[PDB]
Ligand binder design. Structure first.
Ligand SMILES: CC(=O)N[C@@H](Cc1ccc(N(C(=O)C(=O)O)c2ccccc2C(=O)O)c2ccccc12)C(=O)NCCCCCOc1cc2ccccc2cc1C(=O)O
Length: 282
């Protein structure tokens, strides 16, 4: 089971210990392309890189690098592209990735500014009349509309390939209330956020994988993906309680390092899943 496991671990202050076990067991692969000197300014944090085997390649011939990994979950049949919050000089690359990968949705779990510093570039337009043009990748982005709510905001965007003049709609799911420190007391609003993302069909097979990111695209992003996959797995198995979340996290870490950066996020993950399963069946 996982239900009682949460009990044991929790009422034992075992979280910190487990997390470390995960860190210790996590896969270790080569990020050669990421550490090349010419890509130094394409990475936000020197200690957060994409494994070469699962990195996303840009379809340009100049430099196909971008700090982004493709988490491909075989059993749950779900794919996600986890990436770092774009840099002032990687916004064009970011949107080129969304286009080429035919993604339908972008999931953002942080604010442009947190703790007095920038955690992600303002990669999308804030006003309908002020559109953005990424000259280096020949892309145009326009804010069609947005729906601001209590703990999150959904925006409808129109991304256009200036080269072919082809337009495509993209949904921006911005969770705007993640706390300054630690994690949310309740996974409620986070769960509702995920469901809203599911409802849009952005996580579905007829589209390219969703693009998820916070600042490094491993911590909060990890909780998002992890919860989604674990929930989905519970929908597919005869015995839903057999879903071992550690096992799943470790499987995802084969595609990107660091997913879930603190014991808190690990606990929070357990919570959202557990509670999420309840809500679905009522
Ligand atoms: C130079 C510098 O400042 N680096 C920062 C970069 C950074 C990462 C995560 C954040 N975050 C996120 O959610 C996010 O944006 O993702 C948070 C982290 C902690 C708490 C809260 C948050 C939050 O935003 O809510 C950040 C938030 C703000 C600023 C910087 C954030 C950092 O902390 N590095 C530590 C190591 C992690 C990177 C690989 O780990 C590994 C690599 C391995 C490789 C191989 C094998 C085992 C390995 C094991 C590990 C491991 O330790 O698990």
């Amino acid at each position: 089971e996982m239900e009682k496991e949460f009990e044991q671990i929790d009422k034992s202050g075992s979280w910190a210990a487990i997390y470390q076990d995960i860190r210790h067991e996590a896969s270790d692969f080569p990020c050669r392309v990421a550490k090349l000197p010419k890509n130094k300014n394409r990475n936000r944090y020197r200690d957060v890189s994409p494994f070469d085997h699962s990195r996303i390649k840009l379809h340009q011939e100049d430099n196909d690098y971008i700090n982004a990994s493709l988490i491909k979950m075989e059993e749950a049949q779900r794919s996600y592209i986890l990436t770092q919050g774009p840099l002032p000089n990687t916004c064009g690359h970011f949107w080129e990735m969304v286009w080429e990968q035919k993604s339908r949705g972008v999931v953002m779990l942080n604010r442009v500014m947190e703790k007095g510093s920038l955690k992600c570039a303002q990669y999308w337009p804030q006003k309908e009349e002020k559109e953005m043009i990424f000259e280096d990748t020949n892309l145009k982005l326009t804010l069609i509309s947005e729906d601001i709510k209590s703990y999150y905001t959904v925006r409808q965007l129109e991304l256009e390939n200036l080269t072919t003049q082809e337009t495509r709609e993209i949904l921006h799911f911005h969770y705007t209330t993640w706390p300054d420190f630690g994690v949310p007391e309740s996974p409620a609003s986070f769960l509702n956020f995920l469901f809203k993302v599911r409802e849009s069909g952005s996580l579905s097979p007829e589209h390219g994988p969703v693009v998820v990111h916070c600042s490094a695209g491993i911590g909060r992003s990890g909780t998002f993906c992890l919860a989604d996959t674990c929930l989905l797995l519970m929908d597919k198995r005869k015995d839903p309680s057999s879903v071992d979340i550690k096992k799943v996290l470790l499987e995802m870490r084969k595609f990107r390092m660091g997913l879930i950066q603190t014991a808190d996020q690990l606990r929070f993950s357990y919570l959202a899943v557990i509670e999420g399963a309840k809500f679905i069946m009522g």
